Symmetry: D7
Amino acid sequence: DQEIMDAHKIYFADLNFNPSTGNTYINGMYFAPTQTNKEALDYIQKYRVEATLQYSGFKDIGTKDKEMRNYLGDPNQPKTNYVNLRSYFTGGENIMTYKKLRIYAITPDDRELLV
Amino acid sequence: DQEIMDAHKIYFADLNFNPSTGNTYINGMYFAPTQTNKEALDYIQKYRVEATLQYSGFKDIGTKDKEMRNYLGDPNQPKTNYVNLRSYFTGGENIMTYKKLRIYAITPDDRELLV
Amino acid sequence: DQEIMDAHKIYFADLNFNPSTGNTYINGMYFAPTQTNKEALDYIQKYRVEATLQYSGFKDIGTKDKEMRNYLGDPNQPKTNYVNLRSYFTGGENIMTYKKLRIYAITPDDRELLV
Amino acid sequence: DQEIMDAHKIYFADLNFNPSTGNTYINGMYFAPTQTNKEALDYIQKYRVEATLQYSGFKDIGTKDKEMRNYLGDPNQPKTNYVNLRSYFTGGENIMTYKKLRIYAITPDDRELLV
Amino acid sequence: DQEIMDAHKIYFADLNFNPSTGNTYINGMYFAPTQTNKEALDYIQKYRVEATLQYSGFKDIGTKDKEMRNYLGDPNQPKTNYVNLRSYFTGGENIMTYKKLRIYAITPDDRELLV
Amino acid sequence: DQEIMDAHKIYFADLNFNPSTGNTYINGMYFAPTQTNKEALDYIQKYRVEATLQYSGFKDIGTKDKEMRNYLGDPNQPKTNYVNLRSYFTGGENIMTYKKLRIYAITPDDRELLV
Amino acid sequence: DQEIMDAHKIYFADLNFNPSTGNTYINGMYFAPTQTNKEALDYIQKYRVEATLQYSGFKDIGTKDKEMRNYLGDPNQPKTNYVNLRSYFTGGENIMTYKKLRIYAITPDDRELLV
Amino acid sequence: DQEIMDAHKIYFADLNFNPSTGNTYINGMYFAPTQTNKEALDYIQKYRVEATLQYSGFKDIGTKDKEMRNYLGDPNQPKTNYVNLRSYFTGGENIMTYKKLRIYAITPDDRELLV
Amino acid sequence: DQEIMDAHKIYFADLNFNPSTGNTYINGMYFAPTQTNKEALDYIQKYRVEATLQYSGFKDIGTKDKEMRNYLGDPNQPKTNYVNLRSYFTGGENIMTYKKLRIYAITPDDRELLV
Amino acid sequence: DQEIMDAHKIYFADLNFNPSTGNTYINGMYFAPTQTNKEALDYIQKYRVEATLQYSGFKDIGTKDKEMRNYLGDPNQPKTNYVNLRSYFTGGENIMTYKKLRIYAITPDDRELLV
Amino acid sequence: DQEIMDAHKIYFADLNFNPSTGNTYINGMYFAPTQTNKEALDYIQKYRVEATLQYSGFKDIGTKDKEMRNYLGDPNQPKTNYVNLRSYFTGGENIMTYKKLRIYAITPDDRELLV
Amino acid sequence: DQEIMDAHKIYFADLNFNPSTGNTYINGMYFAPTQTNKEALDYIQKYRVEATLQYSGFKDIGTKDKEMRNYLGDPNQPKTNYVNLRSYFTGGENIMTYKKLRIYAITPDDRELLV
Amino acid sequence: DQEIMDAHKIYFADLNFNPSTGNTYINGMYFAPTQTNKEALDYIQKYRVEATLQYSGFKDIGTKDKEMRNYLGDPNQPKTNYVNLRSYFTGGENIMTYKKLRIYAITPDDRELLV
Amino acid sequence: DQEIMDAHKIYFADLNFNPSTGNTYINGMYFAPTQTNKEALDYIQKYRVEATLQYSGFKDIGTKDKEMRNYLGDPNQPKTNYVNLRSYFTGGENIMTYKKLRIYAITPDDRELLV
């Protein structure tokens, strides 16, 4: 059901501010808030990132799975998807310049979100 | 038992005040307080709102179900119905200008309350 | 055993004081303290009030049941009857001007206490 | 300026509730809240009560003076008069049945308030 | 310097929310925030309200004076004017339906703000 | 001593993070940290901003003065200059897109910093 | 075993002091502390008081049973008898002027203690 | 002015309760509450007791002076006299059986109060 | 095994100090600390005291049993015997003048310790 | 005035209890409580002890002076004398076996108290 | 699978700072953070150190086993290996000068990390 | 395996400092820390001390058993032996002058440690 | 007095440990602890550093003055010199690799300490 | 007055215990407690130590002065002398093996105490 699986462009990233610097880091993505007609988040299973770290930026980080907790940290909401940007093969932090998001169902590799 | 199912005009909405603004938002409706002769709240099951958000106001929000907790937050009261204005497909807040309330039993779509 | 069921004239009401007004509201009646010869409180079951609210005073409020907790809030006392003036079909508060108390055993409607 | 000195009928009494009884006692009178045209509270000086105590009710209690603190215990209000019902020749408490209020300027004895 | 003394239309009122009701009351007006070219708030001295109370709404309340504290309760701001809606000849509360605002310099009576 | 008064390009802005949004606001500029050869911050006196607010972005905000507190909130540092982005003719917040900084000595209007 | 059942004259009453009065009230009787030769407290079962209340003093109060807790509120003591002066058909308090103590075994009515 | 100096029969003693005994001890006498016509407490100066201690009861204790603090420990009361039963030549405590009260003005020795 | 059952002369008493007196009372006896060769504390079972109370000193108090808790209140010690001077037929306290200690095995009455 | 200076036999010592021993030590003597006829404590000035320490008991300790604080640690008492058993040429503690008390006025050496 | 078992050069040691000295001690090694292609940490089992202590530095310390807790003390990370530098036959502390790390699989003794 | 059972000379004693004295007491011995080649602590079972107490120093104290808790109070250490110097037939404390340590396996009495 | 002003080689640096890194930073130098014969710290006045920062390491930092507080943070010590490594023209932190220390009396530039 | 200035052999040292070692360090000497006949501590002024440190033990430490605080840390004692073992030219700690104590009056160098 390919095309509507590409059609969930609305998204939100979770932030973390560091004082005594001037920048904000990403530590998670509250992904695909539940609209009226969207239940294709059952077929899609696995996620893969290619981000920009603080040291040696563009690199493959690895493939992990979704963790459906909530939307916007609110208890009375549906369960939406959430890409966790911590359980990944990294040591540094992640910044907000550019990023690529390769997504794995059974055998596609669709690029679903580009900043 | 249609007509008395339309005859429960008494209602109350639950509020939330924001300081450093001047307005009050709605976050729930303590609906149909129990009068002497009203037990038609068993047949009615599902609810649907069409409200005015802070951004792109009039839109269909979706259909959800009742949560009979209490009336006016008081422990020694009967159980009345309560439309929860949080478990709905929204991201913003809701305001107090105008609203429409489409109600679903088995196959009617009766408009039960208009502000 | 009708007449002694009418003969329990001693009673006490439970109060609630509001500051920044000048009046006191009723929120319960510790009813029929246990005297030496009174065990007719087993046959009587249900109670009904016709009180004076803060808005639209004299009206039928409804029929409810007894809740034998204690007398005067004291732990080492017998269990006496208690009319709860909260689990009743009302929204406002109750005041101390005038009141009527219609009491239901199997099929009498005896008026047991008049202020 | 006699007649307007009689014309300040609006008043308020300060209460004290005792639990494990059913009554409320008077312990002060926030007297003559400041209206638009009333500055005759400068000429009047002394006050005298004839109240109903808990024991041997109607008796002369004595003559004392005013204590202009506030109105309704609120800091941002004008200063109004206040009859203190504690600095008086009594030992018991005062109740809310009936009372007489004899007021002393230079040589009148005007009865200013009757309950 | 009459006309610019009429030209300060930007304003803000200070609110107070009561739970277990559904309304919000006014208890002050943070008046005339300091724009780039406005120093006519020195000539104007006294204020007078004609509001709508909870009981017997439209009435003259009286004339009082300004209290320059701050703007929006913030310490690092200029001093702006503030109409205090408490030091006025009233006993009840004030609501948000309609209001009239008669303002007194030396001898004008300009109506400066109408809701 | 014009040119070195233009030559203090190193700067730092003070931030404020809002949760339940995704952005960071500016609320001050710790300006011109003290290098080895820079004592031209005595001649310069007044500052003027032209920023982008949350509503009606590009506008003249006004002219104010410096407040030499510290650098980076640290007690054992020299006193450097600080543009306060709060004591200015605004009501909303300020964001980080674009900004202009017009600076006033006796009679120049030098643009000292552009983002 | 009648006579030694009368021979336990040593006793102690439990007190309660009220400030802002001058008197002390009785609220229990730690009865018959265990001497060397006294085990007749097994045959005796029920107790009855005729005391002096604060209002309408001498009256029959009723028959109740013993509650063997301790002696003098001390944990390392034997269990002695205790007449509870609270679980009795009264509303007021009890005072220390005069009292009568009618005691019920199977069919005697022995007066065991007189003050 | 001898006779009215004898005519102040109203009095009150201050108590102290000891638990794990059954008695109450006297530790002060709030003496001569202020009635309407009594200002003979200026001429009288010194006091002397002959009480009953816990050991070797009836003995002369000594002569001391008055300490006008208040009446009944209440701040808004007049100043009345107070015999302090602690600053006296004793080591034990005082009990409530019998007492004699020898009072010294310039040269009388009037017995003013007998229990 | 009589004689070594008499040969445990080492002992210790447990004290209790009262301030505002000058004396110390006995409230227990940590009896027979465990030496190298002493296991005759198994055959001996019951104890009896004849002490000096505060009132009517020398009297038989009664027979009770041992409570092997510890020695000197220390957790890492063996279990030694302990005569409890509280679970005995008394009402007052015990003092340190003179005492007699009659000890009961099956049928001896050996006096084991004399002060 | 020699003989009455010898006639103040009533005295009291201040104690200190040590747990994990069995004894009580002396750390002060509240000396000569004020009786009715005793004001010879003005002429006497200096004190000298010959006590029994924990090590090398009977020895001259030295001469010191009185410290009139109170009697029995009570604030509402007269000032009586107090021999301080700490400001003396010792290192150990003092016990309660035997003691001698040599007292120095101008030139007598009267032994005033012997235990 | 020998060579890639040698190819995990990335590592991290856990530190402990002592104030009132100038040095930092090692108390653990968070070993082999999980990269993309490394699952040879299953075959390797046992570890052995030859470190430099504070006293008699170079010595064999002994052979122990791995404790897979986390990486960098972070809960949302994979499980990596951890050499515990406490459960080893030592008494002193370990310093940061030089160290040797002999590692035991079934029968190799590969030196895996040298500082 | 006698000789290596004698060869564990490394040891450590556990201390306890008393203020207001100048000495330190022994209250345990963390015995035989685990070296590389020592597992003879399984055959040895029982211990016996001959120490110097505060009173009547050199005496046989008795035979007790080992309590393998830890080494140096540290949780991540092996279990080593520990002679408890409290569960022994003593009443006083132990000091650090001289000591003898007689150790019991099945039938030897080897002296293992001498200070 | 040049040469002994060079002869104070003993020194100490003050540290600061950062967790979640592996290094320690310098934030001060407790300089020249007071030996027996050293009072040349009066003539020397000013100090200058050339350190290695975290970014663009070797650079002139500037000239500042001494702050004689203490030695090793201890209150009962003499006053020694202290180079403050914070009041210097820097923004980053300082590390422990290499450093140069140029010292200014009236007109020498002696290098006093090299790591 | 030389010889009695040598005759004050009684002394006491102040200790400091370190856990996780086995030793106690000296950090002060409460010197010459005040006996009956000793007031030669006025002529003596200065002190000098030659102790054994933790590193390079026997060395001259320097000359300092007395600090008369108290004896044994007790407030109600005379003022005795106190050698402070902290304000001395050292960096390490001091131990309890051997020590020499050279004392300076005007021109003697008497060795007053040897351990």
